């Protein structure tokens, strides 16, 4: 029941205004809160502010400046706005509840938004197979020239998760590339396909490894 | 050592708003819990009582003296909600709770209209 | 301020041993605390609250002592799973400050690597791109390198390494390798190799392809 998920842009032009909303179903805005937590990528966690029960918001001084927390209590919605975004401000954003209590055991799933000038960019998806190729054999997705992060990649619609190991992405010239892993001792009989997302640029496309 | 936790610490209320007041009773010491009102209508602090809630079974009591509503949600939360908010129930709430006859409190959250 | 300081900065344990995590507020606030595990790329789980109530669904071997200023998330008998980070809140009054975390490392005896190595697709070099791959996974320590020969000779123009968060079950870490070239680049040579070294093996684990 209770559930919350973050939305807005993922790529933010420096200086401009990050806009998110968090749409929330399971309790009242009315009598509870929402506060935005954030973490830069490698950095830990900072709680940034909330709006109460009855609209009175709260803010840490690091961020009361350029900061701005509001509702749709028709809606089940709570935004938060910020001014003039640089680089340090490259994070995840997650809304989570305080619901009858003082601590956070609800949270948003997060959203990524980078800060940066560079223009959205749709990954290129590409099999990986043994080269003239064991019972249990290595393949792999290569997921090249996206931005900005994240991306998703999953194995047979998430039903191969087991033996996965997906990479962080690394940044070259503004563009990312991933990898992703996965092992089979079915293959070629049974087929296995990567899915990938990479919702910036509204891609969506699976690939599937097959020999040479 | 039971301790009560009140939520909110607060409520600046509109007219007609519904509230829900909730306390966690920590510990895990006694029964259930009683909610309990300070009338802002009266000058001297004359706590009068609102309702108890069995900790075992859903149970509540009501003293005879529409406008709440209460329930246990999952656990060790009870939960208190004006159904809708006016001068009648304008003032100041909280739980109490009896572990070896000893009456403990949780603190006090003021429920004043709007500002 | 209340400033909240996590230490250690982070720890490397075994399977199945005691493990205290410290969190010092500068200012007194009673029992006013939250612990939380995180994973990389997850959302924060919430293990105990108000100092020492463990949240319903956390594991026994979760535990929280302290009041006042000094505070200890303890796990008794360490798991795979427990690989993480963990922050402290102060929690009842604003502003609800996160302390920086502790790293929780795992110990677990040496493993291998798989290492698998991936010619460009054909795809790929239908839009005149080449990209070698060379996957090295599930080994342990996480001390490892790995490197790139076209024809016998080091390459290291054009490659990029990332290395995964230790697993979840094994307690391993695995890394992908690619060589990004020029498809005219790619086909001026014939071998491609990957060699790795690790402490599991005094010669170096190769695997190559001839183009």
Known sequence: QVQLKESGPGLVQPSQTLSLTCTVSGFSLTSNSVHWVRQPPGKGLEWMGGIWGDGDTDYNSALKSRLSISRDTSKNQVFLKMNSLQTDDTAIYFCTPLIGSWYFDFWGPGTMVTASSAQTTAPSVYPLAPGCGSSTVTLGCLVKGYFPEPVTVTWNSGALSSDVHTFPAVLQSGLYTLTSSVTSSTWPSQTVTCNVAHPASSTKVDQKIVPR | ?115 | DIVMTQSPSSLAVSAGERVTLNCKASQNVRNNIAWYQQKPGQSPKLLIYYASYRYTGVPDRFTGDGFGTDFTLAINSVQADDAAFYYCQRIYNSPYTFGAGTKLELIRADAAPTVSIFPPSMEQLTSGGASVVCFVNNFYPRDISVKWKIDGSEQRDGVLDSVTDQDSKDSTYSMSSTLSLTKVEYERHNLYTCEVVHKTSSSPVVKSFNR
């Open chain 2, 1 to 115: 050592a039971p301790e009560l936790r009140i939520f909110p610490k607060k409520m600046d209320a509109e007219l007609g708003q519904k509230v829900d007041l909730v306390c966690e009773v920590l510990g895990s010491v006694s029964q259930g819990c009683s909610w309990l009102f300070q009338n802002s209508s009266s000058k001297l602090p004359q706590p009068t009582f609102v309702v108890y809630m069995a900790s075992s079974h859903n149970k509540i009591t009501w003293d005879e003296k529409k406008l709440f509503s209460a329930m246990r949600d999952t656990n060790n939360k009870y939960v208190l909600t004006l159904n809708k908010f006016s001068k009648e129930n304008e003032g100041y709430y909280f739980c109490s709770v009896i572990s070896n006859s000893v009456m403990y409190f949780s603190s006090v959250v003021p429920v004043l209209q709007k500002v």
